Amino acid sequence: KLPPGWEKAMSRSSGRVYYFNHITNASQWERPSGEPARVRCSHLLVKHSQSRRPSSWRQEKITRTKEEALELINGYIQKIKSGEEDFESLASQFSDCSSAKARGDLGAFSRGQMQKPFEDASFALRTGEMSGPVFTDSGIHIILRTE
Numbered sequence: 001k002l003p004p005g006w007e008k009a010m011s012r013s014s015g016r017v018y019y020f021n022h023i024t025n026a027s028q029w030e031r032p033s034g035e036p037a038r039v040r041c042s043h044l045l046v047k048h049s050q051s052r053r054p055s056s057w058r059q060e061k062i063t064r065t066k067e068e069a070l071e072l073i074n075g076y077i078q079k080i081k082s083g084e085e086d087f088e089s090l091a092s093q094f095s096d097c098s099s100a101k102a103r104g105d106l107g108a109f110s111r112g113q114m115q116k117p118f119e120d121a122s123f124a125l126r127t128g129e130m131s132g133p134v135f136t137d138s139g140i141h142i143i144l145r146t147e
């Protein structure tokens with residue numbers, strides 16, 4: 001039926017079916033379309049006080065809660081999806097990763113290099129697709145598979 005990872009769901013607010021991916025946390029209205037040695041991704045990281053290192057170039061002391069970080073992530077996803085903001089712009093301005101300076105680009109990587117939830121989401125994304133919020137010990141990620 002659907003590229004494994006995807007399941008059907010129903011909108012609580014509208015009653016229309018949609019599709020959700022439990023590896024990427026992506027959700028979308030259309031039935032999804034459907035692995036390489038390597039993928040290339042960008043990401044926007046929002047850290048929180050329980051992050052493995054609760055500090056970043058934006059903030060010496062990251063004090064926001066996990067819930068607050070998820071609200072920020074969800075806000076960025078909305079603006080990216082509406083076209084109000086570009087992923088690259090929000091990553092440059094607001095990612096707590098040093099990769100912010102490169103518009104979030106991490107370059108290419110294989111399995112075994114990144115944190116597992118990040119890796120699994122990255123490899124389950126199709127080229128050009130964006131994840132939903134992805135949780136790791138670093139914080140919460142929006143992941144964009146570029147290659």
Ligand SMILES: CC(=O)Nc1cccnc1
Nearest residue numbers: 097098099101102105106
């Ligand atoms: C890959 C990473 O974690 N950071 C980074 C920093 C600067 C430029 N590109 C990437």
Ligand SMILES: CC(=O)Nc1cccnc1
Nearest residue numbers: 098099101102105106107
């Ligand atoms: C492994 C890592 O953190 N990558 C990195 C660091 C600095 C600049 N560019 C990339």
Ligand SMILES: [Cl-]
Nearest residue numbers: 058072093094
């Ligand atoms: Cl801010």
